[PDB]
Amino acid sequence: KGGVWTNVEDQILKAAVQKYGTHQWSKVASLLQKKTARQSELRWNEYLN
RNA sequence: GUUCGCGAAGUAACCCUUCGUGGACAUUUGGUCAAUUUGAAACAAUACAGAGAUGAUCAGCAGUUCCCCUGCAUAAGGAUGAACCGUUUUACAAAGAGAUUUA
Numbered sequence A: 001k002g003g004v005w006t007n008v009e010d011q012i013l014k015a016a017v018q019k020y021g022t023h024q025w026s027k028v029a030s031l032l033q034k035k036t037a038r039q040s041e042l043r044w045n046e047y048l049n
Numbered sequence B: 001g002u003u004c005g006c007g008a009a010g011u012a013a014c015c016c017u018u019c020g021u022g023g024a025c026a027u028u029u030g031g032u033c034a035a036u037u038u039g040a041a042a043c044a045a046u047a048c049a050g051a052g053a054u055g056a057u058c059a060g061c062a063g064u065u066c067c068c069c070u071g072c073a074u075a076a077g078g079a080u081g082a083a084c085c086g087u088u089u090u091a092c093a094a095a096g097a098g099a100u101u102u103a
């Protein structure tokens, strides 16, 4: 269960944010598998953005 | 048909009856509409499917329309009622550069 971040799913994210915008995360974890709302937005705001 | 009155005849004795005539009484309904095929109900059945916002499953209010339906309704429902989701070129110019033609 313990995961780490491929730049694959990371890129799919930044594309997703680049569409749906930040605060719709529950959709951004739909495209993205393996991952959750709080996980997505956690790494986003704390790192990727 | 009633009544008033006149005349005539008969009965009669100023009437009872019959005939004729004058007068009054009484005075214009209804239709926007013909009687089943060809001057207009709408459902149902067959087939085709089989519920907006989303990646997905639902609550919903609205907004516009030469669409309306149910409801006493200025209530509220009818898939949040349905239709919307499509097609998309000119107030048009200014500066610069090359090719062509001409005074």
Ligand SMILES: [Mg+2]
Pocket (backbone or CB within 6 Å): none
């Ligand atoms: Mg309504």
Ligand SMILES: [Mg+2]
Pocket (backbone or CB within 6 Å): B079
């Ligand atoms: Mg619904």
Ligand SMILES: [Mg+2]
Pocket (backbone or CB within 6 Å): none
């Ligand atoms: Mg409506």
